[PDB]
Structure formats: structure tokens, C-alpha cells
Amino acid sequence: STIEERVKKIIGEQLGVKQEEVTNNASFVEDLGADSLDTVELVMALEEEFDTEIPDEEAEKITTVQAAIDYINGHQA
Ligand SMILES: *P(=O)(O)OCC(C)(C)[C@@H](O)C(=O)NCCC(=O)NCCSC(=O)CCCCCC
Ligand code: NA
Ligand SMILES: [Zn+2]
Ligand SMILES: [Zn+2]
Ligand SMILES: [Zn+2]
Ligand SMILES: [Zn+2]
Ligand SMILES: [Zn+2]
Ligand SMILES: [Zn+2]
Numbered sequence: 220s221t222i223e224e225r226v227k228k229i230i231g232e233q234l235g236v237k238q239e240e241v242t243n244n245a246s247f248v249e250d251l252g253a254d255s256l257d258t259v260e261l262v263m264a265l266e267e268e269f270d271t272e273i274p275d276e277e278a279e280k281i282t283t284v285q286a287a288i289d290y291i292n293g294h295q296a
């Protein structure tokens with residue numbers, strides 16, 4: 220599996236949205252319906268899976284599925 224597939228799967232699971240709905244251009248809040256808690260829980264789920272901590276101010280600007288995939292490809296070690 221690819222990072223794209225693994226990140227999309229976690230997002231779908233965390234947000235309770237079907238896979239075909241988690242497109243690379245989808246906005247977590249505007250398109251996937253995420254609320255305040257969802258944001259906190261999503262960020263922590265991805266920090267655990269990919270073993271990397273993201274500054275909260277930085278996570279705040281990651282608004283789309285593609286932005287999350289990019290961060291991960293750029294920071295996981
Ligand atoms: P409530 O009213 O308090 O807040 C609602 C808002 C302010 C809209 C929050 O939901 C919010 O600020 N959302 C911003 C977008 C968002 O959900 N960002 C996080 C996406 S996942 C992420 O950034 C992690 C990527 C990888 C990190 C290391 C693995
Ligand atoms: Na693989
Ligand atoms: Zn595959
Ligand atoms: Zn849906
Ligand atoms: Zn909620
Ligand atoms: Zn663990
Ligand atoms: Zn945090
Ligand atoms: Zn802020």
C-alpha cells in the first residue's frame with residue numbers, strides 16, 4: 220500500500236466518511252464535514268501512525284487531503 224492509500228484510509232475512519240468520498244482535493248471541514256474534536260483526533264491519529272509530531276499552528280493550515288499526504292511524505296522518518 221502507498222502513503223496515499225494509508226492516509227486516506229485513516230481520514231475516512233476518523234471522520235466516518237466513505238472511501239470514495241475522500242478525494243485528494245477534499246477539504247476536511249468544508250467537504251468532509253469535520254468538527255472541532257474531529258480535527259484534534261485526526262491530527263493525533265496521523266501523528267501516531269507516521270511517528271511524527273506536527274506543530275499545532277502548522278496543522279491548522281493543512282486543510283485538504285492532499286496537504287496531509289504531502290506533510291507526511293515530507294516528514295516521516
Ligand atoms: P472548533 O470550533 O474549536 O474548531 C473548528 C476548526 C477551527 C475549523 C478546526 O476544525 C480547524 O482549525 N481545522 C483546520 C483543518 C484541519 O482539520 N487540519 C488538520 C488536518 S490532519 C493534519 O494536519 C496532520 C497531517 C500529518 C501530521 C503528522 C503525521
Ligand atoms: Na506498498
Ligand atoms: Zn493498493
Ligand atoms: Zn458521506
Ligand atoms: Zn463531533
Ligand atoms: Zn504505536
Ligand atoms: Zn497537537
Ligand atoms: Zn491558530
Ligand SMILES: [Zn+2]
Binds near residue numbers: 270295296
Ligand atoms: Zn519510522
